[PDB]
Amino acid sequence: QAITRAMADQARTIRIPVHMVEVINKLGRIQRELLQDLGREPTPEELAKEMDITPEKVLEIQQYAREPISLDQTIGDEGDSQLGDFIEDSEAVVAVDAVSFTLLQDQLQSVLDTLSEREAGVVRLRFGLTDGQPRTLDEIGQVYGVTRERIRQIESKTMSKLRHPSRSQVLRDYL
């Protein structure tokens, strides 16, 4: 009991629950016995029938049972290169979209400045441009000493204005 429990708990780099590893071994035993007494590799539906679970559960168990690889095995025919140097770091900066976003911010600041101070302020507060948190109509009305209906009217007229081609012909290619 102790040896089986410890082996199940610390056998893999990715820890697996005791019941899950138990059913994994049960499925492996069932598959081996079926192959031995059938002569043909059985189908997941047949495995599900014999083990009395669902085929999607069988597929999930099979996906879970897989163990990872090492980033330092010589993948090539000769030994001069590991596996980790062939893997792209997706979390890095594209180094192009960064400058694209910077110039998009510059163009947005320009197109905002083409409007007047009131509209620029209300839209910036509404969409959270100068600050991370986007303010709501009630907050804008409280700041500017007017009602949320007036704020909504200003927002609607500004949104209508910004959709003109004179103000969208520069922002079209940024999406």
Partner: protein, 146 residues
């Protein structure tokens, strides 16, 4: 030969007590990444296995100690921990190198520095560069020298 290291220890404000280890440090996870490839396949960095062995043997030693175990078992577990730490710091330095699946020896911290595949000669002195190219070459007898 002895006085070399003796004077080396004496002249500084260094203490030889640090030569024995009481708290093993853990390398930051990003330098030993656990990346998921396409299709859900994972791939360890081969240091996680050594760290797991260290942690498991330390915890088992703690459990044996506070449970109360015979000196034979306690000493065996202590030797286990010692050998695991030795393998983590330098695999294959003493005894059979610790190997994973496929009879491939594991890579230790000192293996990240030794040889041509080490950090120094592989990434500190020569690196892959950007704004570069590569192609076959032909003769340009109509060109000028510059």
């Amino acid at each position: 030969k002895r006085l070399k290291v003796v004077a080396a220890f004496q002249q500084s404000g260094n203490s030889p007590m640090g030569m024995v280890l009481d708290a093993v440090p853990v390398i930051p996870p990003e330098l030993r990444p656990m990346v998921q490839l396409d299709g859900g396949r994972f791939a360890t960095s081969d240091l996680n296995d050594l760290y797991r062995r260290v942690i498991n043997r330390n915890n088992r030693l703690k459990r044996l100690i506070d449970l109360g175990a015979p000196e034979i078992i306690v000493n065996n577990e202590k030797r286990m921990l010692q050998e695991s730490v030795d393998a983590l710091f330098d695999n294959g330095r003493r005894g059979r190198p610790v190997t994973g699946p496929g009879n491939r020896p594991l890579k230790s911290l000192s293996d990240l520095l030794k040889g041509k595949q080490g950090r120094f000669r592989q990434n500190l002195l020569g690196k892959r560069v950007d704004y570069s190219g590569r192609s076959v070459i032909v003769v340009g007898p109509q060109l000028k020298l510059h």
